[PDB]
Amino acid sequence: GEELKITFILKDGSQKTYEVCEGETILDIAQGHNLDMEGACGGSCACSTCHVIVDPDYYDALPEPEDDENDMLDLAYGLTETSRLGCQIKMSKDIDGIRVALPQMTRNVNNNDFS
Ligand code: FES
């Protein structure tokens, strides 16, 4: 069954509700639709905001990532029972109407990485 949608709740707090293909990453719809959105991974670029929280409907089918990857989320405060990386898990046939919210971070200690 063809074409899908994604809701994101903004860092500023608005809701924005967009049409997409399957196989797209949440970081790739955030950066492909140019959501006003920054975060803890990759310089806020091609690796990206990382941090989302999902609806308890659409997480419930979903995988979880390594202790190095779920940490990239944990640099936000108060991290939720459905808070997750944009990046492991994409738009698929299971998702027809999915949401995420896009939370705020700033940590007391900070670092950088490059190739
Ligand atoms: S934005 Fe890079 S692993 Fe999530």
Residue 53: which residues within 8 A CB-CB, separation 6 or more? Answer: 80, 82, 83, 84, 100, 101, 103
Which atom of ligand 1 is nearest to 69's Cα?
3
Residue 37: name the closest of 105, 95, 91 by CA: 105
Helix (H) or strand (E) holding 84: strand 83-85
- Does the C-beta of 105 come closer than 6 Å to ligand 1? no
What separation in Å is there between the alpha carbon of 44 and the centre of ligand 1? Answer: 9
The Cα 112–Cα 67 span in angstroms is 18
Q: Which CATH superfamily is domain 1-115 in?
A: Beta-grasp domain (3.10.20.30)
Expt. technique: NMR
Strand order from edge to edge, sheet including 15-20:
15-20, 4-9, 99-101, 51-54, 83-85
Q: How far is the C-alpha of 29 from the C-alpha of 96, rounded, in Å?
A: 15
